[PDB]
Amino acid sequence: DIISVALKRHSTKAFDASKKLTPEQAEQIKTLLQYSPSSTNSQPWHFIVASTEEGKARVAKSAAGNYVFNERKMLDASHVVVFCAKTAMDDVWLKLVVDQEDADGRFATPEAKAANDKGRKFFADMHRKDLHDDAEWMAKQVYLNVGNFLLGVAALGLDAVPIEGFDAAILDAEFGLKEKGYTSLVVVPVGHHSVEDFNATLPKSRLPQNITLTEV
Amino acid sequence: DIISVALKRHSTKAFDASKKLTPEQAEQIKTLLQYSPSSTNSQPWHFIVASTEEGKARVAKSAAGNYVFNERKMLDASHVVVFCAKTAMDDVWLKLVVDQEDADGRFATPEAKAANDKGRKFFADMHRKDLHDDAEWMAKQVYLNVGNFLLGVAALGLDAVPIEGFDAAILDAEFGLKEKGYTSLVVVPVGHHSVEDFNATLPKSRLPQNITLTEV
Ligand SMILES: Cc1cc2nc3c(=O)[nH]c(=O)nc-3n(C[C@H](O)[C@H](O)[C@H](O)COP(=O)(O)O)c2cc1C
Numbered sequence: 527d528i529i530s531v532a533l534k535r536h537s538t539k540a541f542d543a544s545k546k547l548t549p550e551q552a553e554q555i556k557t558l559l560q561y562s563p564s565s566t567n568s569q570p571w572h573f574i575v576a577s578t579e580e581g582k583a584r585v586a587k588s589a590a591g592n593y594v595f596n597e598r599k600m601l602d603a604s605h606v607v608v609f610c611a612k613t614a615m616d617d618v619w620l621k622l623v624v625d626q627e628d629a630d631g632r633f634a635t636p637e638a639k640a641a642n643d644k645g646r647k648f649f650a651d652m653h654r655k656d657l658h659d660d661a662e663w664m665a666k667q668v669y670l671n672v673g674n675f676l677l678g679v680a681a682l683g684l685d686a687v688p689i690e691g692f693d694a695a696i697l698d699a700e701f702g703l704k705e706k707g708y709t710s711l712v713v714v715p716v717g718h719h720s721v722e723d724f725n726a727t728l729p730k731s732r733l734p735q736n737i738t739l740t741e742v
Numbered sequence: 743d744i745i746s747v748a749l750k751r752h753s754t755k756a757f758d759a760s761k762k763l764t765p766e767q768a769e770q771i772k773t774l775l776q777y778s779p780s781s782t783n784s785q786p787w788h789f790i791v792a793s794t795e796e797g798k799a800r801v802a803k804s805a806a807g808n809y810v811f812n813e814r815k816m817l818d819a820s821h822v823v824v825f826c827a828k829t830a831m832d833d834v835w836l837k838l839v840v841d842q843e844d845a846d847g848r849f850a851t852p853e854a855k856a857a858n859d860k861g862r863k864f865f866a867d868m869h870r871k872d873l874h875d876d877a878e879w880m881a882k883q884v885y886l887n888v889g890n891f892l893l894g895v896a897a898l899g900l901d902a903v904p905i906e907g908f909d910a911a912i913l914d915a916e917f918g919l920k921e922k923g924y925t926s927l928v929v930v931p932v933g934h935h936s937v938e939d940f941n942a943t944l945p946k947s948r949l950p951q952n953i954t955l956t957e958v
Pocket residue numbers: 535536537539596687688689690691692712730778779780781782783886
């Protein structure tokens with residue numbers, strides 16, 4: 527059951543480098559990344575899935591220095607996912623999205639398609655021209671994807687840990703993301719924890735609902 | 743199978759108001775909200791769970807103007823969750839979190855607790871005092887919670903729909919959130935879809951991985 531998963535999952539502090547995802551699990555995590563929902567189905571994201579030792583080493587470069595202690599997590603985990611957000615929502619991407627929805631048969635008429643495109647453009651423009659938060663808006667969708675992902679991999683019986691402790695400037699440069707129109711936000715190593723994972727046996731802690739939740 | 747859940751869930755466009763969550767399910771969705779992970783376990787959030795007609799009507803006030811299209815969703819679903827983020831990170835909240843972790847038994851010594859507190863303050867200050875993006879940083883954690891929530895409720899066999907199409911100023915004012923230190927970000931009606939939910943039978947659509955995903 528999913529509640530058991532939510533209560534038993536945890537942020538892995540150390541991974542067993544010998545335990546790799548099966549080809550099936552490797553495919554499944556990519557499915558999770560792709561099918562996450564997003565506002566207007568904008569999917570303002572890009573994912574870098576590092577599974578080779580050299581690939582993970584490249585990602586780990588972002589932890590060199592001040593976040594050096596996050597390097598082992600990025601190197602020992604079987605697969606490491608870098609969640610990136612678009613730096614700007616261009617019309618080409620908007621058309622890409624609506625044309626894909628059309629190709630998938632979500633529109634019964636050309637007017638239905640036009641209405642969908644018009645609505646998506648309306649909110650994209652609102653965030654860009656009036657709220658002046660389009661970058662944050664897209665980053666928010668990426669974080670939602672991350673939330674979906676962490677629970678999903680836990681439900682697959684895999685360990686993982688979300689990471690904000692890295693230098694996005696270094697990671698972006700390493701993969702030339704800026705020129706490509708993206709920026710790294712969260713790094714998530716996935717695999718199996720080792721005996722070195724001190725957080726695997728500690729009790730989980732959250733504020734009481736009497737503080738965080740109001741019922742009406 | 744969490745992958746089947748991810749592939750089969752959908753944004754519900756119409757709910758059957760007579761199909762209520764069971765008592766246990768009502769508690770389970772609250773558990774999901776509570777146990778979502780967050781950066782430094784900051785849990786910079788508040789949730790409003792509306793299950794009464796009066797409660798849902800109060801939330802539905804936000805479905806005005808360009809958002810009237812979302813009023814029925816907020817009124818017809820069994821339970822409606824309002825995801826809120828703190829408007830500013832303060833030391834009182836930081837102390838609350840570390841003291842809770844201590845009460846739950848995560849620290850073996852006073853030094854361990856102090857180290858955890860210093861680490862959390864280090865990143866909170868980075869956002870609040872240097873980057874000046876603590877409002878966005880906290881909102882991102884709320885969206886991660888939302889992502890975890892949508893997959894979780896789908897795994898419970900419940901329908902839902904995330905909503906950004908609501909007037910947050912209206913919702914904030916109706917619940918006096920500003921003075922309390924919070925602001926509404928996403929509204930999520932939860933329940934069971936009706937035969938009128940046209941999106942329950944439409945194919946899901948996502949961009950292909952050859953565009954959004956790079957393996958290395
Ligand atoms: C977006 C995000 C960034 C985080 N960054 C890191 C990190 O850089 N290093 C680390 O050890 N844990 C990291 N964490 C893990 C948290 O400290 C954690 O989710 C929280 O203490 C709750 O514990 P749990 O995940 O085991 O339930 C992060 C969590 C999130 C959601």
